[PDB]
């Protein structure tokens with residue numbers, strides 16, 4: 001039989017709306033993002049999807065997207081595992097800054113590189129910064145080397161793909177239907193790996209907020225196909241890159 | 248050091264409001280119950296409580312109480328384990344019936360016995376009944392003997408206390424701060440065991456919806472003290488037994 005995996009980026013966050021770099025800052029869903037999360041769950045139900053297990057990050061924009069989806073499915077009882085390994089790419093000293101203001105002060109091309117350059121890291125925090133993850137109780141079990149000062153997509157891959165191979169994929173292989181509710185760069189990391197994409201190809205991909213992305217796997221767990229659920233015109237428009245100045 | 252445990256009964260459910268026997272029927276919180284759940288979380292924060300791990304049932308009135316509490320604590324990231332072993336006592340063929348109507352048809356004393364008699368079971372379902380737990384996907388892993396047709400408090404103890412001793416108490420002993428969000432009879436089962444109560448004593452106890460109940464344990468994990476958090480006059484009034492005809 002074919003095995004299905006469902007991926008969903010968190011619904012729009014308040015800092016997505018306000019055009020601020022977020023990273024590990026734990027911002028909530030906007031009002032529109034709550035709407036998006038509920039719509040994704042209703043659509044999954046309509047399309048005949050239910051699950052056996054869910055993975056998400058430790059960031060509330062993703063966790064709350066999952067809770068809203070589970071309620072639409074009448075699966076609030078589902079087992080859930082919440083892991084920092086699925087967190088958004090850390091944005092270093094850019095966390096909290098407005099993207100347009102930052103592009104004006106430092107240059108539009110510099111901001112594009114800090115957003116998207118494959119192995120490029122945003123400017124680093126120091127450990128005394130209020131934003132350093134070591135101060136936060138949900139990272140109490142992490143080492144200095146695990147606690148980021150900044151991350152690139154390359155470094156995001158280096159934590160997401162081991163979690164995939166050690167934990168998520170084996171659960172799928174045991175016959176369980178998995179949903180992953182996560183973030184732009186953690187899901188881009190997984191998609192690059194599953195789709196055999198180059199650095200040039202992954203730089204072009206934007207996964208839109210709140211849109212289910214379904215993968216089919218064959219009996220050897222080689223990906224067979226992937227597709228979005230919902231309104232094609234709306235999704236494709238939403239998957240275009242947005243300027244630093246906003247939409 | 249003293250170890251703290253926090254217990255909380257689900258916020259008021261829609262069938263609590265409507266005076267219907269619920270059991271394993273998966274009814275949601277009423278509007279007032281959502282208010283109660285959020286208030287419990289805000290109070291726990293104000294009183295200096297945070298957690299390392301949460302247990303709850305597979306029934307949404309309890310799960311949603313926990314989600315609301317965790318959001319007030321800014322601990323949506325907390326590890327959660329959802330177990331049928333913490334479910335409400337199953338109400339057999341009474342599930343969905345109005346308590347007042349049932350007391351009129353069968354007698355007030357008969358209803359009191361079906362509600363509260365220690366080893367008394369409500370009238371049984373048959374396996375073909377739409378309400379039989381075997382039809383529901385979240386009990387797919389249970390055996391016939393685990394799937395109830397009816398339960399008493401005695402039978403509720405027989406599943407809650409092993410879960411306590413095998414799973415919950417060891418986690419506490421490892422130094423983790425636990426919260427349990429559950430149900431009237433599953434929490435009464437645990438309290439009887441922890442408080443060394445007789446059958447006569449436990450029959451008198453009503454744990455009110457949405458009220459934190461804190462236990463202190465000594466170094467040998469013998470209970471030292473237990474107390475409610477919140478407004479004493481309001482809580483004590485709410486802990487009185489309500490007639491079959493309602494309040």
Ligand SMILES: [Cl-]
Nearest residue numbers: 078079080327
């Ligand atoms: Cl959860």
